[PDB]
Design an enzyme around this catalytic site. Sequence first.
Site, PDB file in Angstrom:
ATOM      1  N   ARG A   1      40.206  20.308  51.507  1.00 24.76           N
ATOM      2  CA  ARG A   1      39.897  21.428  51.012  1.00 24.76           C
ATOM      3  C   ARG A   1      41.013  22.524  51.622  1.00 24.76           C
ATOM      4  NH1 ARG A   1      34.696  24.949  52.851  1.00 24.76           N
ATOM      5  NH2 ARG A   1      35.683  26.886  51.942  1.00 24.76           N
TER       6      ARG A   1
ATOM      7  N   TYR B   1      44.465  32.821  54.530  1.00 29.67           N
ATOM      8  CA  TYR B   1      43.348  33.682  55.449  1.00 29.67           C
ATOM      9  C   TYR B   1      44.071  34.604  56.005  1.00 29.67           C
ATOM     10  CZ  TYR B   1      39.437  30.393  55.855  1.00 29.67           C
ATOM     11  OH  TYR B   1      38.551  29.447  55.487  1.00 29.67           O
TER      12      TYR B   1
END
Lengths: 281, 281
Positions: free
Chosen positions: A78, A89
């Site tokens: 993932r 992020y």
Amino acid sequence: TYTTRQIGAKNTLEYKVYIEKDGKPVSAFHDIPLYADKENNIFNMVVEIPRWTNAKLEITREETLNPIIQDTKKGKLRFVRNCFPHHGYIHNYGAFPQTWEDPNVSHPETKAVGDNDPIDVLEIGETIAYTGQVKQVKALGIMALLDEGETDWKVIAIDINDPLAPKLNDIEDVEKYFPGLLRATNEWFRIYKIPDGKPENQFAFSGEAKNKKYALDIIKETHDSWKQLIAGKSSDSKGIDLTNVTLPDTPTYSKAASDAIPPASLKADAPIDKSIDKWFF
Amino acid sequence: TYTTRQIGAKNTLEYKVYIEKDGKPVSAFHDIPLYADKENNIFNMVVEIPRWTNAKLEITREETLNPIIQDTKKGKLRFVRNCFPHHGYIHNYGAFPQTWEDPNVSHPETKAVGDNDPIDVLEIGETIAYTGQVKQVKALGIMALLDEGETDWKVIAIDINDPLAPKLNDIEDVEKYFPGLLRATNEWFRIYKIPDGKPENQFAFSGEAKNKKYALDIIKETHDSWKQLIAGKSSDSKGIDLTNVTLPDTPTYSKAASDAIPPASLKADAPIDKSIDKWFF
Ligand SMILES: [Mg+2]
Ligand SMILES: [Mg+2]
């Protein structure tokens, strides 16, 4: 609390990063102190995901000594997708050890059960961290994210060694020195799962970043949930592995659980599929 | 127009990349054909900088076979800083070979001369490109930055192999499928020097990206300039090394120049300083 043991290559199903205290694996969930300095509220942060990466690396709740392993979806690794204008992020992403988002009780601020993980931390300093790093951070504020309908607080923190750390003492300082970051964070955690065919997340308080005091209050809450869970006294430990090697007053304490972990076998980072490049709009 | 040969370790004053055609080094400025398909206006793009990197890489016009090296100023290697909410470069940044911006020629709608380089190409597709890669792109539009008396055009293009490329043909389609990318492009080129102590850059057409035809006109102009350049007919090719190994009637043809190029280096990337991590607000 100290070093890192990498099994295998990054971006790979075999990959694990154990945290070592003195060369020996400790539980990244249970065995690392919440406080590096309770006196001055300096926390120990476990870094999971460096800023501007994609691989969804987590402290694994059900694996003995809770190494950081990559999350998978129907067997495939993932990664979080790039949501324009963001790249992976936009914070060094981690957890406070020795905390728990209680999944069994409804949280009054959000009206939802917790996501059953340590409480998450966004460390906003300038240097990109690495997976398995324990760093020292101070709390600036906290955001009440409902991530897929679960209470999922995000602590806003800064590394104690960041040049800016002295100037940053509460949440107003983040807007002052990091203009637009909090707005961006509110946006990022709302949208970061659309690319996966999932809905937009939500925040309580309209996504307002609550201040340091409010952060301390909620971290406290999650610490006490952890003390119950690690005591064996949770109504449902939800399959979590509570094996630890530092807390002798707990049922699941075992010093040589450490010894049975395989030795480091670092390989070079495996290549990431090119699809993870894509910028979603 | 085929492979690459890297000399030096990446992020290093020694670092150079050459384009090889069938094993043999050619000029990245002169020996890669502008058109991969003239009648359909599919151009060959020489990629210099992958998206979301920092190092300021460029075809040298003053070195033989015009390798891609890192820019320096007064002996220091040059990186673009991270400007919130952007991470490094927000496009795959390249140039079209066999084009050149005549400094001895001026535009009137953009009252400014050439900057003496190949025309810059921003490829907007999903896959991150590699330094020295030759990809087939189509032009969609063109912006004009005004760096001190000289017009710095930036073709906006997309890789012909991109999943979206069939849907995209003109500049309005970028607004359609890449909402916000144009304003970001606009913002990035405006501020990306401010961290380096520089002023804000300045757009022509009030930051308007003009359309495909407007881009085809400019591109075709700069190819005609290059043509007189490589033919030795240019008014002033100061500092340009016109050596090439595929154009056998040019004054500067020299196959042996290919032969002179060192073998590909076996050095791992040099480390980049952590100060480059910094996000500037
Ligand atoms: Mg969580
Ligand atoms: Mg230029």
